[PDB]
Design a protein around this ligand. Structure first.
Ligand SMILES: OC[C@@H]1O[C@](CO)(O[C@H]2O[C@H](CO)[C@@H](O)[C@H](O)[C@H]2O)[C@@H](O)[C@@H]1O
Ligand SMILES: OC[C@H]1O[C@@](CO)(O[C@H]2O[C@H](CO)[C@@H](O)[C@H](O)[C@H]2O)[C@H](O)[C@H]1O
Ligand SMILES: [Mg+2]
Length: 580
DNA sequence: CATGCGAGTCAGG
DNA sequence: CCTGACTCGCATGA
């Protein structure tokens, strides 16, 4: 049965009630400077559909949109807020976001549209967006009649589902997480995405030029060493050259054939000169295709900025993700790749990039949650945690710790967080299970509180069916009861890791909210540009750097109070590369 | 041919 | 281990 609604030709007062479900539809995946194809409003007076050209030109409607006292319930309000920012219109008063509500209730559900969130509460009187708009090449906005009914049905679903969702969040003790953390954060991410990051395209194009030269040279050397030309970028073709023509040993296989991953190649290097060259080719090729060409493809030519989109409702841990471009994985480990950061510059003359990052926030969080006396004391002394871990597991003094000892202790720490097992650490340390197991055993002997936490959290996940973070985010782990060792083991590692990675995500999100309020109170022009899991990147006038050096670290360090101090390091410079 | 996606790979925290 | 993007190449549609 069709849903009744008014297809309005003009805005009326009853459409501007102080409480309503609102839909501002942006069909394009990337909503930056994208079209708004329709608007739907559902409130106590009825259901309405408005053409965007009409609504967005109406002074009363625009005022209503920007009035914080007029409350709106939506799905993915960031999408609408950003689409509206590009049109110079402010969206305020969003008191409920169904996408974020659904995400907090169960990140694993993968809610990507109103229909999916609605199905969680047995509401199915709304179609999935994909069914209405089609996919990819066939994607298209349907005729007004079909479009209007769909938007009205989505607004109707939001109108009906708000209460049930808030009720469950309340029962889960997640009501404040939604209202005081995720929703306010959504507005901050919208501002960051809209601001964008300026790119020195001339710089990137030059790096690409010289990179192309080097690739050409290495490519030729590889053909020479192989005795023939082939597609180096083809694992299948490369596998034939290495394991058949050159007879290199096969130490690892993939589900489909020979493995040619960097890990395997490093072990084969001593057998043939072609290996080192392939690894070098892989490094430069990655930079060229992904960080030079790929980046240049998404830079807006009129502003020379990239406008990422942060997915706030995707990860099972509470972390954000970044797309088009992904600004959370720009090279930094190797110097050649790190230079790519010289292309990310301040958006204004005489401005600088400021970057602040938490020092070992995940391990500090673990010290707090597990209440491990040894680990807490370590951070209270602000010790080098890897050297300290080495001292304890190997039973040696500080000056007796060798570089390799610290390297292995660091690997244990890198893993301990991710609940890593004997077979997981072994690969990273290129050792055996029995040995790796003894390392973990030694770690627990030194950090008994951590061992107790790992045992207790797994039992809790089994008992409750989920684990939680410091700010009450949750993750259900149904596989925790599986009778399949591998499946159960993974769930166990997730039970151990989620409260750690998840609580660290909670902390930085809270820091972002606190920071934005502080920047406004101080009327600084400085603003957030990016978040990379445990670090915040801002840009500001050079005349604000000294103030930011004291302000940003303090706000980040004071976001939450743990049993151990939080420590933040910071740097600033002319480019993101220099902010080191 | 065009479109699209699983596999393999590798970048970050 | 949490993510996203790029290549290649078998697969399939309009
Ligand atoms: O001593 C703890 C005791 O063992 C428990 C099993 O009986 O088991 C937990 O840990 C093992 C791995 O060590 C997993 O295989 C089980 O699934 C997990 O429940 C627990 O029930 C009890 O407290
Ligand atoms: O939090 C984001 C929210 O949007 C969804 C809707 O399906 O993602 C859409 O937009 C992003 C950014 O452009 C794309 O990467 C996705 O492909 C597109 O579906 C996501 O599922 C939901 O959580
Ligand atoms: Mg750090």
């Amino acid at each position: 049965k069709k849903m009744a609604f008014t297809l309005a030709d003009r805005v009326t007062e009853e459409m501007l009630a102080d409480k309503a479900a609102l839909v501002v539809e942006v069909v394009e995946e990337n909503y930056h400077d994208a079209p708004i194809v329709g608007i739907a409003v559902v409130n106590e007076h009825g259901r309405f559909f408005l053409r965007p050209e009409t609504a967005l030109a109406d002074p009363q409607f625009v005022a209503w949109l920007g009035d914080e006292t007029k409350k709106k319930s939506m799905f993915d309000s960031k999408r609408a807020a950003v689409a509206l920012k590009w049109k110079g219109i402010e969206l305020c008063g969003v008191s409920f976001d169904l996408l974020l509500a659904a995400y907090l209730l169960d990140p694993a559900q993968g809610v990507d549209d109103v229909a999916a969130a609605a199905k969680m509460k047995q509401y199915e009187a709304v179609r999935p967006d994909e069914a209405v708009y089609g996919k990819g090449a066939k994607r298209a906005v349907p005729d007004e009649p079909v479009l209007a009914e769909h938007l009205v049905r989505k607004a109707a679903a939001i109108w009906e589902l708000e209460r049930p969702f808030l009720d469950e969040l309340r029962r889960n003790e997640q009501d404040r997480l939604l209202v005081e953390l995720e929703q306010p954060l959504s507005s901050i991410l919208a501002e960051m995405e809209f601001a964008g990051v300026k790119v020195d395209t001339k710089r990137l194009e030059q790096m690409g030029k010289e990179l192309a030269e080097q690739l050409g040279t290495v490519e030729q050397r590889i053909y020479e060493l192989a005795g023939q030309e082939f597609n180096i970028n083809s694992p299948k073709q490369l596998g034939v050259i290495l394991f058949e023509k050159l007879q290199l040993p096969v130490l690892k296989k993939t589900k489909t054939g020979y493995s040619t991953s960097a890990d395997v190649l490093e072990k084969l290097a001593p057998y043939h000169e072609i290996v080192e060259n392939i690894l070098h080719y892989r490094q430069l090729g990655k930079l060229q295709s992904t960080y030079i060409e790929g980046l240049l493809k998404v830079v807006r030519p009129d502003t020379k900025k990239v406008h990422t989109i942060f997915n706030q409702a995707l990860t099972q841990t509470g972390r954000l993700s970044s797309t088009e471009p992904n600004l959370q994985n720009i090279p930094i480990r190797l110097e050649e790749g790190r230079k790519i950061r010289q292309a990310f510059v301040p958006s204004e003359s005489d401005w600088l990039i400021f970057a602040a990052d938490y020092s070992q926030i995940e391990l500090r969080v673990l010290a707090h949650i597990a209440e491990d006396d040894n680990l807490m004391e370590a951070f209270r002394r602000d010790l080098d945690i890897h050297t300290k871990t080495a001292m304890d597991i190997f039973q040696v003094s500080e000056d007796e710790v060798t570089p390799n000892m610290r390297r292995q202790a660091k690997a244990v720490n890198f893993g301990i967080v991710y609940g890593i097992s004997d077979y997981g650490l072994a690969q990273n340390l290129n050792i055996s299970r029995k040995e790796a197991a003894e390392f973990i055993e030694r770690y627990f002997e030194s950090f008994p509180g951590v061992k107790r936490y790992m045992e207790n959290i797994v039992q809790e996940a089994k008992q409750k069916g989920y684990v939680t973070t410091l700010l009450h985010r949750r993750r259900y782990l149904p596989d925790i009861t599986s009778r399949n060792f591998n499946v159960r083991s993974f769930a166990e590692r997730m039970a151990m890791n989620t409260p750690i990675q998840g609580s660290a995500a909670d902390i930085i999100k809270k820091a972002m909210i606190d920071l934005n309020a502080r920047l406004k109170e101080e009327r600084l022009q400085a603003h957030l540009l990016l978040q990379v899991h445990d670090e915040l990147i801002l840009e500001a006038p050079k005349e604000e750097m000294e103030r930011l050096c004291r302000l940003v670290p303090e706000v980040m360090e004071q976001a939450v109070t743990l049993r151990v101090p939080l420590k933040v390091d910071y740097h600033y410079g002319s480019t993101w590369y220099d902010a080191k």
